[PDB]
């Protein structure tokens, strides 16, 4: 579809809205002092607006503008353009929308202590590693996808913290361990296969916070973790998602 952009507010353009609808507009939106009228394709209109075809980037921008802060006690996840006047610890992330990220942030605040060394396995946007530094920990975020590293680095900087970010997985992290705590938002079968190496990555008394787990698959993780010598400490869920916390 195409947009016809006009300078002005809906209130000011009121006189010509009927004409835009007669001309076939199916949608209208006031967007920062401009009225955008949406059509299947350009048609002849006397209003002196400008036609432009709508693309995926326009959809992304519109969606972005509709984003609001997301609470994840003790944190609040904010888009770089959000302002927040609450008590919550801010976590600025270039567009924390998932249940699992939320479970992970709340669990992290409980199990992480100032001065703890943290491994955020499958760091992605770097949100967990960033929250760990904000809580007084020292974190390493690793991801097998090199492409996420630059955005993670940039989110860190926006948050005034500096975790270490590295391409790779668990084996790549070992030289920097052992760690006091590992947080891994992955999926149940992967946790199950890594259980033995999770034990190796942590110091005695260390903690493993596992999420990205569907309720129907929780059994797999309980079994592999018990099998690996971990003791369960806490469980929490949101929707169909579960976080399981263990001590080594
Ligand atoms: N085996 C693996 N080792 C390291 N990273 C992985 C592995 N498998 C998947 N990943 C990354 O794990 C991340 C999973 C994300 N859902 C987690 C992002 C972030 N930690 C969060 O809680 O929101 C993705 O960025 C994957 O690229």
Q: What domains are defined for the chain?
A: 1-55 (3.30.70.1170), 56-95 (1.20.5.1350), 96-248 (3.40.50.150)
Cα–ligand 1 centroid distance for 123 (angstroms): 5
- Burial label for 67, CB within 10 Å (0-12, 13-18, 19+), is middle
CA pair distance 65, 79, nearest whole angstrom: 9
Ligand 1 probe mutation, 101, 122, 130, most atoms within 8 A of CB: 122
The reply, when asked if residue 143 is annotated as ligand binding, is: yes
Around 53, how many Cα atoms within 13 Å sit in the side-chain half-sphere?
Answer: 3
**Vertex 62: Cα angle to 37 and 1 (nearest 5):** 45
Ligand 1 probe mutation, 101, 144, 213, 243, most atoms within 8 A of CB: 144
Spatial strand order of the sheet with 231-238 comes to 164-167, 138-143, 117-121, 179-185, 202-214, 241-247, 231-238
Cα–ligand 1 centroid distance for 174 (angstroms): 17
The reply, when asked if residue 14 is annotated as ligand binding, is: no
Contact 38, 25 (CB under 8 A): yes
CA pair distance 234, 243, nearest whole angstrom: 8
CA 145 vs CA 65, 100, 177, 185: distances in Å: 28, 19, 21, 15
Residues with CB under 6 A from ligand 1: 100-101, 104, 120-124, 127-128, 142-145, 148, 169, 185-186, 212
Around 13, how many Cα atoms within 13 Å sit in the side-chain half-sphere?
Answer: 23
**Residue nearest atom 18 of ligand 1, based on CA coordinates:** 124
CA 19 vs CA 29, 37, 56, 174: distances in Å: 15, 11, 28, 67
């Amino acid at each position: 579809m195409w947009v016809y952009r006009l300078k002005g507010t809906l209130e000011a353009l009121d006189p010509i809205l009927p004409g835009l609808f007669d001309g076939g507009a199916r949608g209208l939106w006031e967007r920062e002092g401009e009225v955008w009228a949406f059509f299947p394709a350009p048609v002849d209109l006397p209003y002196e607006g400008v036609w432009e075809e709508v693309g995926d980037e326009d959809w992304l921008e519109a969606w972005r503008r509709d984003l609001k802060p997301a609470l994840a006690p003790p944190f609040v996840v904010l888009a770089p353009w959000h302002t927040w006047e609450g008590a919550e610890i801010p976590l600025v992330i270039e567009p924390g929308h998932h249940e699992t990220t939320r479970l992970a942030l709340k669990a992290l605040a409980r199990h992480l202590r100032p001065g703890d060394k943290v491994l955020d396995l499958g760091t992605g946007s770097g949100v967990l590693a960033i929250a760990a530094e904000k809580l007084g920990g020292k974190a390493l975020g690793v991801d097998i996808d090199p492409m996420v590293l630059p955005q993670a680095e940039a989110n860190a900087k926006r948050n005034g913290v500096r975790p270490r970010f590295l391409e790779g997985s668990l084996e790549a992290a070992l030289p920097f361990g052992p760690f006091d705590l590992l947080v891994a938002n992955l999926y149940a079968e992967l946790h199950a296969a890594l259980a033995p190496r999770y034990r190796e990555a942590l110091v005695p008394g260390g903690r493993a916070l596992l999420t990205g787990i569907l309720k129907d698959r929780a059994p797999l993780v309980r079994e592999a973790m018990a099998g690996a010598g971990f003791r369960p400490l806490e469980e929490a869920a949101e929707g169909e998602w579960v976080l399981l916390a263990y001590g080594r």
